[PDB]
Amino acid sequence: SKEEILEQLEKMVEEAKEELKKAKDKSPLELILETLTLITLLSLLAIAKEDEETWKKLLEEALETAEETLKLVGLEELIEEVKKEIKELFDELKKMIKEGESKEKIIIYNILKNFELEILLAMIEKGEKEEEIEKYRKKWEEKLKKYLEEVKTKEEALKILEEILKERKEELEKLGISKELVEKHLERIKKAAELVLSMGSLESSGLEVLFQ
Numbered sequence: 001s002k003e004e005i006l007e008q009l010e011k012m013v014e015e016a017k018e019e020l021k022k023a024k025d026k027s028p029l030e031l032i033l034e035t036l037t038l039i040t041l042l043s044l045l046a047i048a049k050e051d052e053e054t055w056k057k058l059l060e061e062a063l064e065t066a067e068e069t070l071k072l073v074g075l076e077e078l079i080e081e082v083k084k085e086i087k088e089l090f091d092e093l094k095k096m097i098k099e100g101e102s103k104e105k106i107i108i109y110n111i112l113k114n115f116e117l118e119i120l121l122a123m124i125e126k127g128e129k130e131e132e133i134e135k136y137r138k139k140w141e142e143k144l145k146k147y148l149e150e151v152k153t154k155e156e157a158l159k160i161l162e163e164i165l166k167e168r169k170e171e172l173e174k175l176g177i178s179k180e181l182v183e184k185h186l187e188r189i190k191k192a193a194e195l196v197l198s199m200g201s202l203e204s205s206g207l208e209v210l211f212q
């Protein structure tokens with residue numbers, strides 16, 4: 001149900017905001033984990049609603065959350081670049097919707113782009129060398145190209161989602177975040193993505209398919 005699914009997604013957003021607020025005793029990496037989990041949820045909710053004023057408000061909320069976290073963790077010098085990336089992502093999501101890209105493709109693209117931003121911020125915060133950062137950026141650019149060429153159905157999207165989550169979990173662990181903490185947040189991303197993937201079996205063309 002579109003309304004039940006929405007209610008669950010705003011519940012997940014509220015819970016993520018509550019955890020992000022409990023930031024005093026969190027490390028910068030844990031804060032970055034909370035923030036990109038929230039922004040992933042916000043962008044998944046915007047994809048689900050497909051509504052102009054919702055796009056505007058959730059983009060505002062994502063930009064606000066990113067700026068607040070960057071200030072807290074002493075990465076204020078990144079604010080403009082990060083805001084640009086977030087805006088670029090939201091613009092691209094809207095573009096792929098307007099051009100008729102499959103919802104599977106849009107959801108995988110969104111998850112991949114949020115992770116790319118997340119891992120970049122985590123590596124910058126940990127002081128990784130520019131060559132290692134580039135290594136990870138290029139490997140995931142290649143992976144994105146393949147995944148978007150590969151994902152044609154909901155089953156394929158669910159399998160690719162699992163693969164993505166497994167590998168990024170390994171990378172977040174290597175950066176020093178508690179494996180179990182990573183798992184809690186990546187599980188929340190998986191559940192939201194499955195919820196949005198659920199809608200579209202019931203959008204108007206999907207209904208025409210089922211009912212003929």
Ligand SMILES: [Zn+2]
Pocket residue numbers: 019020034185
């Ligand atoms: Zn949390």
Ligand SMILES: [Zn+2]
Pocket residue numbers: 050203
């Ligand atoms: Zn649609």
Ligand SMILES: [Zn+2]
Pocket residue numbers: 051052053054
């Ligand atoms: Zn509206």
Ligand SMILES: [Zn+2]
Pocket residue numbers: 060
């Ligand atoms: Zn405003």
Ligand SMILES: [Zn+2]
Pocket residue numbers: 084085088
């Ligand atoms: Zn960019």
Ligand SMILES: [Zn+2]
Pocket residue numbers: 098099
């Ligand atoms: Zn066009």
Ligand SMILES: [Zn+2]
Pocket residue numbers: 170173
């Ligand atoms: Zn390992």
